[PDB]
Amino acid sequence: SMSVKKPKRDDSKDLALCSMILTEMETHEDAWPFLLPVNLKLVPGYKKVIKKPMDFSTIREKLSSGQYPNLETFALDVRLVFDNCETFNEDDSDIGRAGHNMRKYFEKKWTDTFK
């Protein structure tokens, strides 16, 4: 509260570490559905159904331009990618399995790096 602060958790490496995680996600073989924004002119249903589209290229641009205030807002956008994928894709499709695999991959890197 006012003039009463919890000890400073060191965040000075967070930008670099989030950039490393994102590089790992971009180079994973199963990242192909997630690399670029879904083409809203060419994919029926997407625009209306998925209220907040997100993809790895968009996260990379946001990360490179100071648009994440902290490492939690970064993780929220990464999880949005996989939450959107589950909304739109059956679990037993190639894209649906890709998104489960990538979520698992992310969440381990996230825990190992920060928790």
Coordinates of C-alpha atoms in Angstrom, one line a residue:
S1 CA 0.0 0.0 0.0
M2 CA 1.2 3.6 0.2
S3 CA 4.9 3.6 1.1
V4 CA 4.8 -0.2 1.8
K5 CA 6.3 -2.3 -1.0
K6 CA 6.9 -6.0 -1.5
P7 CA 10.6 -6.8 -2.4
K8 CA 11.7 -6.1 -6.1
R9 CA 11.5 -9.3 -8.3
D10 CA 14.2 -8.7 -11.0
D11 CA 12.4 -8.1 -14.4
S12 CA 15.3 -6.7 -16.3
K13 CA 15.9 -9.8 -18.5
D14 CA 12.1 -10.4 -19.1
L15 CA 12.2 -8.9 -22.7
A16 CA 15.2 -11.0 -23.8
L17 CA 13.8 -14.1 -22.3
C18 CA 10.3 -13.6 -23.8
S19 CA 12.1 -13.0 -27.2
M20 CA 14.0 -16.4 -26.8
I21 CA 10.8 -18.2 -25.9
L22 CA 9.0 -16.7 -29.0
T23 CA 12.0 -17.8 -31.2
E24 CA 11.6 -21.3 -30.0
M25 CA 7.9 -21.2 -30.7
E26 CA 8.5 -19.7 -34.2
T27 CA 10.9 -22.5 -35.1
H28 CA 8.9 -25.4 -33.8
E29 CA 7.7 -27.7 -36.6
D30 CA 4.1 -27.5 -35.5
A31 CA 4.1 -23.6 -35.5
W32 CA 2.9 -23.4 -39.2
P33 CA -0.8 -22.7 -38.4
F34 CA 0.2 -19.8 -36.1
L35 CA 3.0 -17.9 -37.9
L36 CA 0.8 -15.4 -39.7
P37 CA -2.6 -13.9 -39.1
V38 CA -5.5 -15.9 -40.3
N39 CA -6.7 -14.5 -43.7
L40 CA -10.1 -13.1 -42.7
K41 CA -11.2 -12.7 -46.4
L42 CA -10.4 -16.3 -47.1
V43 CA -11.5 -18.3 -44.0
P44 CA -15.3 -18.4 -43.5
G45 CA -16.5 -17.9 -40.0
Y46 CA -13.2 -16.6 -38.6
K47 CA -13.9 -13.0 -38.5
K48 CA -17.3 -13.3 -36.7
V49 CA -16.4 -16.1 -34.3
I50 CA -12.9 -15.2 -33.1
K51 CA -13.2 -11.8 -31.4
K52 CA -9.5 -11.3 -30.8
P53 CA -7.3 -12.9 -33.5
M54 CA -3.6 -13.4 -32.5
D55 CA -0.6 -15.0 -34.2
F56 CA 3.2 -15.3 -33.6
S57 CA 4.1 -12.5 -36.1
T58 CA 1.8 -10.1 -34.4
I59 CA 3.2 -11.0 -31.0
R60 CA 6.8 -10.5 -32.4
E61 CA 5.9 -7.0 -33.7
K62 CA 4.3 -6.1 -30.4
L63 CA 7.3 -7.4 -28.5
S64 CA 9.8 -5.5 -30.8
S65 CA 7.8 -2.2 -30.4
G66 CA 7.2 -1.9 -26.6
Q67 CA 3.6 -2.9 -26.7
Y68 CA 3.9 -5.5 -23.8
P69 CA 3.9 -3.7 -20.4
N70 CA 5.1 -6.8 -18.6
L71 CA 5.8 -10.6 -19.1
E72 CA 2.2 -11.5 -18.1
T73 CA 0.6 -9.5 -21.0
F74 CA 3.0 -11.4 -23.3
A75 CA 1.8 -14.8 -22.0
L76 CA -1.8 -13.7 -22.3
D77 CA -1.3 -13.1 -26.1
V78 CA 0.6 -16.4 -26.5
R79 CA -2.3 -18.3 -24.7
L80 CA -4.9 -16.4 -26.9
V81 CA -3.3 -18.0 -30.0
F82 CA -4.0 -21.5 -28.6
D83 CA -7.4 -20.6 -27.1
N84 CA -8.5 -19.3 -30.5
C85 CA -7.2 -22.5 -32.2
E86 CA -9.3 -24.7 -29.8
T87 CA -12.4 -22.5 -30.5
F88 CA -12.2 -23.0 -34.2
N89 CA -10.6 -26.4 -34.7
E90 CA -11.5 -29.9 -33.8
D91 CA -9.0 -31.6 -31.4
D92 CA -8.6 -34.4 -34.0
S93 CA -7.5 -32.2 -36.9
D94 CA -3.9 -31.5 -37.8
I95 CA -4.3 -27.8 -36.7
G96 CA -6.1 -28.8 -33.5
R97 CA -3.3 -31.2 -32.5
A98 CA -0.7 -28.6 -33.5
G99 CA -2.3 -26.1 -31.0
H100 CA -2.3 -28.6 -28.2
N101 CA 1.3 -29.5 -28.8
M102 CA 2.4 -25.9 -29.0
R103 CA 0.5 -24.9 -25.8
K104 CA 2.2 -27.7 -23.9
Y105 CA 5.6 -26.7 -25.4
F106 CA 5.1 -23.0 -24.4
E107 CA 3.9 -23.7 -20.9
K108 CA 7.0 -25.8 -20.0
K109 CA 9.3 -23.1 -21.4
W110 CA 7.3 -20.6 -19.4
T111 CA 7.7 -22.5 -16.1
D112 CA 11.3 -23.4 -16.7
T113 CA 12.3 -19.8 -17.5
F114 CA 10.4 -17.8 -14.8
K115 CA 8.8 -20.1 -12.1

